Design an enzyme around this catalytic site. Structure first.
Site, short mmCIF file in Angstrom:
data_model
loop_
_atom_site.label_atom_id
_atom_site.label_comp_id
_atom_site.label_asym_id
_atom_site.label_seq_id
_atom_site.Cartn_x
_atom_site.Cartn_y
_atom_site.Cartn_z
N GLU A 1 0.81 -1.21 0.00
CA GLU A 1 0.00 0.00 0.00
C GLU A 1 0.85 1.27 0.00
O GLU A 1 0.53 2.22 -0.72
CB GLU A 1 -0.94 0.02 1.21
CG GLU A 1 -2.08 -0.96 1.15
CD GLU A 1 -3.16 -0.61 0.11
OE1 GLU A 1 -3.00 0.36 -0.67
OE2 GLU A 1 -4.16 -1.33 0.05
N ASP B 1 -6.41 8.20 -0.30
CA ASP B 1 -5.88 7.23 0.67
C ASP B 1 -4.70 7.84 1.41
O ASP B 1 -3.83 8.45 0.79
CB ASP B 1 -5.40 5.94 -0.01
CG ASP B 1 -6.50 5.23 -0.81
OD1 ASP B 1 -7.71 5.50 -0.58
OD2 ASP B 1 -6.15 4.37 -1.65
N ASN C 1 -8.94 5.28 3.40
CA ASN C 1 -9.64 6.12 2.43
C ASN C 1 -10.51 7.17 3.13
O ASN C 1 -11.15 6.89 4.14
CB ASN C 1 -10.51 5.23 1.55
CG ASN C 1 -11.21 6.00 0.47
OD1 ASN C 1 -12.41 6.31 0.56
ND2 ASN C 1 -10.45 6.36 -0.56
N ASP D 1 -15.09 -4.66 10.10
CA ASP D 1 -16.28 -4.11 9.49
C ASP D 1 -17.04 -5.12 8.64
O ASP D 1 -18.07 -4.76 8.04
CB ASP D 1 -15.91 -2.88 8.64
CG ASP D 1 -17.11 -2.02 8.27
OD1 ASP D 1 -17.79 -1.51 9.19
OD2 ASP D 1 -17.37 -1.85 7.06
#
Ligand SMILES: Cc1c(C)c2c3c4c1OP(=O)(O)Oc1c(C)c(C)c5c(c1C4)Cc1c(c(c(C)c(C)c1OP(=O)(O)O5)OP(=O)(O)O2)C3
EC number: 3.2.1.17
Length: 129
Positions: A35, A52, A59, A101
């Site tokens: 990332e 990001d 994000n 989540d």
């Protein structure tokens, strides 16, 4: 701050990412490499007008407020600049919320495509953690 691989693994371990939601530490180190290249100050802008931020490229549409993203929900309740600090606390706390989540680490496309199913513990070998 640009972390070394072992330095970041040690920090993430201290912050309790090892086997958080069942994801061994190497998953989180692998994700940060693909990332951000381990750079806490990394930013990249997306097509939908979000950006990001940070070592895990969290994000701004859903998770943090950067003052310019339409639809901003700020679920981690932080400004995105907090994700750029040399102190990874904010990125870790928000990542913990993201991985809890519903989709686990599949929320990170780079983890899904370059880390998931690989020998992730290789990312922490040689670091006497
Ligand atoms: C689950 C859920 C919560 C907890 C909400 C809202 C919605 C919501 O359902 P959802 O299925 O997401 O449907 C929506 C979709 C698809 C879009 C595109 C919406 C909204 C909703 C409605 C409106 C909305 C809501 C907001 C906030 C802060 C914003 C910015 C916001 O505008 P924006 O994102 O442009 O437009 O309030 P909050 O997040 O507290 O409450 C209201």
């Amino acid at each position: 701050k640009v972390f070394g691989r072992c330095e970041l693994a040690a920090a993430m371990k201290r912050h309790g990412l090892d086997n958080y939601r069942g994801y061994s530490l190497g998953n989180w180190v692998c994700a940060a490499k693909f990332e951000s290249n381990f750079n806490t100050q990394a930013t990249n802008r997306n097509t939908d007008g979000s950006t990001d931020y940070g070592i895990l490229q969290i994000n701004s549409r859903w998770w943090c407020n950067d003052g310019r993203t339409p639809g901003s929900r700020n679920l981690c309740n932080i400004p995105c600049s907090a994700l750029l600090s040399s102190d990874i606390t904010a990125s870790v706390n928000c990542a913990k919320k993201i991985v809890s989540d519903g989709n686990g680490m599949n929320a990170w496309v780079a983890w899904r495509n370059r880390c998931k199913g690989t020998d992730v513990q290789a990312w922490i070998r040689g670091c006497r953690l």
